[PDB]
Amino acid sequence: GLVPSHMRIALMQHTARPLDPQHNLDLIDDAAARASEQGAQLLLTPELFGFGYVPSQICAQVSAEQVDAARSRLRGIARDRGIALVWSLPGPEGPEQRGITAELADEHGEVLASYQKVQLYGPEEKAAFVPGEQPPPVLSWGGRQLSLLVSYDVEFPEMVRAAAARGAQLVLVPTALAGDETSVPGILLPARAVENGITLAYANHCGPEGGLVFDGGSVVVGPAGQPLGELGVEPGLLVVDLPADYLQDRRAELHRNWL
Amino acid sequence: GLVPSHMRIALMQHTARPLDPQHNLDLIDDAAARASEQGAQLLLTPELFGFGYVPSQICAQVSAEQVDAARSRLRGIARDRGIALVWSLPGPEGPEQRGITAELADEHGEVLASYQKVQLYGPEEKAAFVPGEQPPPVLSWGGRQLSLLVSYDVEFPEMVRAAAARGAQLVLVPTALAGDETSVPGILLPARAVENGITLAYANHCGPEGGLVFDGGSVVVGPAGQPLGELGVEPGLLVVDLPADYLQDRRAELHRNWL
């Protein structure tokens, strides 16, 4: 609609082609343009979209120079489409030393924050990538505190609590969820929102990619655990206007000893 | 039914009368008898049921001797009805030094485990009771590892993770949830089950008690986050037959630094 809320976000849900960054970044540019036209101020895009979700092939075939070229292209998209952008690429080190990352650029193309996925999923990711060792970043943008996590991270309450403990209000999550795993968006995401009093945005692939059929189901969940908007299984651009004191009450000095 | 599963549990959902332990323990004895008749091996009963959920009045009026008399009565119920029993009373110390507790007695009346609520809810509880300082107990019974938590505890992912980290498979939760707080059983409990791969049982008051209208909604949630059985708002006896590797994958040595 007309702007009702002083923050409008977009999530891109699409299918990537393995090892075809020109194609996949063309898709991200198209979504950035369309989101900007609709008055969105930020676009969230899915995990590893630029090269496809193909961990073993990214480690065998995708060089650090190719990563950097993709990163430069995405910074340029942010700037040229005049929209903040969250993307997810391999990290900048060599193939054997890098992780899976998420980065936020603002509408000027400045990179505000970089995060390396802490919780790798399965043996293919753990062979292809180095896990992150740093907590999620939290930063002011657009009138709220934003944070980043990547896919499997959000399934751990600890990871979302780590962001919320820093002050996060809006947690943005590139993902790549296949296998009709309804429990993640259906059961875990609502709880992550409620148990911290935060909003979460979850941007997935959909369709046939890299040997898997991704679930779609991209969603923005508010602090009551309610979907503010959601997609189905097909490509789409989700645009959402955003409007007990667990964080204080938690006995963190005991909890930390009991994990 | 006929026994299909080698564990059948019962949850008692009822209304307590404030400061009337004879009445409220008579209700627990009745439910224990009925659960035993149906082949249940354990009965779970709600938070503070024996004196009613009236924190300020328990601290002003209920002596340690009166607590101990109630405790003895409940041990006797376990033994005489031949069923394991989970109850929740004030702890055994003076009014100014005790917490809210849960205890498990086996079908012989032996007290297997005692737990003191770590996460107190609201200012009335925090005036009336001392928070616990120990992690949840985990113990073999009936072929599985059982654990105890009390009401608000379960709303913290940390508390359930603390039990699961110890090996819990079945977490038993006396509660006292009023105010049409649908998110706890609806959103948080399913996630606590899924994110640990455990079963949780949640036994609430219902109806008018101590100035509040308790929600009922007692439920047993399986590891998929699915209700194995559930009650509505009225008194009842719920009887249930029980049939990603988050616990391993979690980077607990980082998480503990980030809470």
The domain ranges of chain B are 1-259
Dist CA A106 CA A140 (whole Å): 11
Backbone region of residue A19 per phi and psi (left: phi > 0; alpha: psi in -120 to 50; beta: other values): left
**Longest Cα pair distance anywhere in chain A, in angstroms?**
50
Rg of chain A over all Cα atoms, to the nearest angstrom: 17
In chain B, residues with a C-beta closer than 8 Å to the C-beta of A162 are 255, 258-259
Fill in the amino acid letter for A47. Answer: E
CA-CA distance, B32 to B75, in Å (whole number)? 12
Asked if CATH classification 3.60.110.10 holds for the domain at B1-259, the reply, yes or no, is yes
| ∠ CA B143-B149-B155, rounded to 5° | 120
**B251–A119 C-beta distance less than 8 A:** yes
Nearest CA in chain A to B126: A249
Q: What are phi and psi of A176, to 5 degrees?
A: -155, 80
Check: CB of residue A68 under 8 Å from CB of residue A91.
no
Here the tokens at position B7 are 């564990």
B157 token code pair: 């992912």
User: Gaps in chain A (C–N > 2.5 Å) come after which residues?
Assistant: 4, 243
CB contact set of A92 (below 8 Å; sequence gap of 6+) = A64, A67, A68, A71, A98
d(Cα B25, Cα A43) in Å, to the nearest integer? Answer: 58
Alpha-carbon gap, residue B220 to B119, rounded angstroms:
21
**Angle at the Cα of A210 (from A207 to A213), degrees rounded to 5?**
30
- Coil, strand or helix at A222: coil
- Interchain pair A255, B158: CB under 8 A: yes
Element (H, E) at A97: none
Distances (CA, A) of B117 to B27, B101, B166: 23, 6, 17
Q: How many CB atoms lie within 10 A of CB A22?
A: 12
Query: Which residue from B163, B10, B125, B147 is spatially nearest to B78, judged by alpha carbons?
Result: B10
Helix axis angle for B157-165 and A157-165, nearest 10°, is 140
- d(CA A129, CA A151) in angstroms, rounded, equals 14
Residue with tokens 């009026």: B61
Comparing CB atoms, the residue among B152, B183, B194 nearest residue A188 is B194
How much of chain B is helix, strand and coil, in % rounded to 5?
A: 35, 25, 40
A&B contacts, CB < 8 Å: 118
Q: How was this structure determined?
A: X-ray
User: Do the Cβ atoms of B103 and B30 come closer than 8 Å?
Assistant: no
Pick the closest to residue B131 from B148, B147, B150 (CA basis). Answer: B150
Half-sphere exposure of B156 (CA within 13 A, CB side): 30
Question: Which amino acid would we find at residue B92?
Answer: P
Minimum-distance CB partner of B244 among A155, A225, A256: A155
Q: What radius of gyration do chain B's Cα atoms show?
A: 17
Widest pairwise Cα distance in chain B: 50
Cα–Cα dist B230/B217, whole Å: 6
Torsion sign (Cα): B75, B81, B87, B89: negative
Inter-chain CB proximity B135 and A161 less than 8 Å: no
CA distances from A226 to A174, A192, A232, A246 (A): 19, 11, 16, 18
Beta bridge partners of A199: A170
User: Which of B158, B37, B91, B218 lies closest to A196 in space, CA to CA?
Assistant: B158
**B242: closest CA of chain A, how far (Å):** 21
Tokens of B89: 């009373």
Q: What is the DSSP string of A45-82?
A: --TTGGG-S-HHHHHHH--HHHHHHHHHHHHHHHHHHT
CA distances from A218 to A29, A164, A232, B137 (A): 19, 21, 7, 39
Instruction: Using alpha carbons, list the distances in angstroms from residue A203 to B46, B125, B245.
Output: 41, 41, 23
Rounded Cα distance, B105 and A125, in Å: 46
Residues constituting chain B: 259
Nearest Cα to Cα of residue B75 among B112, B115, B129, B123: B112
- Percent helix, strand, coil in chain A, to 5, is 35, 25, 40
Q: Across the strands, what pairs with B185? A: none
In degrees, rounded to 5, the angle at the alpha carbon of residue A171 between the alpha carbons of residues A192 and B149 is 20
- Tell me the resolution in Å: 1.5
